[PDB]
Amino acid sequence: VDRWIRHAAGVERPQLLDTETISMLTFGSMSERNAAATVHGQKAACELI
Partner 1 sequence: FFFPVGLYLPEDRGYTTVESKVKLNDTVRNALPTTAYLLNRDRAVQKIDFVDALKTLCHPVLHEPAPCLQTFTERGPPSEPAMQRLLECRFQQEPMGGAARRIPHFYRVRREVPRTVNEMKQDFVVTDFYKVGNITLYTELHPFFDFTHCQENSETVALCTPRIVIGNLPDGLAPGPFHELRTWEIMEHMRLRPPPDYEETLRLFKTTVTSPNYPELCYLVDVLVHGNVDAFLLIRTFVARCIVNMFHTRQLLVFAHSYALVTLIAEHLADGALPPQLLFHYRNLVAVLRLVTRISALPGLNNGQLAEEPLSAYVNALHDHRLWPPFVTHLPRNMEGVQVVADRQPLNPANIEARHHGVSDVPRLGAMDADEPLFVDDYRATDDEWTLQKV
Partner 2 sequence: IEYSLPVPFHRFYSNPTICAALSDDIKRYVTEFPHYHRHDGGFPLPTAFAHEYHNWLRSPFSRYSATCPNVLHSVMTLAAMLYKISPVSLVLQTKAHI
Partner 3 sequence: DEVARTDEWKGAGVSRLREVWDVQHRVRLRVLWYVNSFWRSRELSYDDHEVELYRALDAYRARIAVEYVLIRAVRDEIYAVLRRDGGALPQRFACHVSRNMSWRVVWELCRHALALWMDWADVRSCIIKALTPRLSRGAAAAAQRARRQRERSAPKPQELLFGPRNEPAEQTWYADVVRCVRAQVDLGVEVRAARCPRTGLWIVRDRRGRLRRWLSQPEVCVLYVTPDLDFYWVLPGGFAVSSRVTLHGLAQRALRDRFQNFEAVLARGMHVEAGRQEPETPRVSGRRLPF
Binding site for partner 3 (CB under 8 A): 14, 16-17, 19
Query: Does residue 27 bind partner 2 (CB under 8 A)?
Result: no
- Residues near 29 by Cβ (< 8 Å), separated by ≥ 6? 17, 18
Query: Does residue 1 bind partner 2 (CB under 8 A)?
Result: yes
Closest CA to 17 of 4, 6, 26: 26
The listed partner (partner 2, partner 3, partner 1, none) that binds 29, CB under 5 to 8 Å by sort, is none
Cβ atoms < 10 Å from Cβ of 35:
7
Footprint on this chain of partner 1 (rule: CB under 8 A): 1, 4-12, 40-41, 46-47, 49
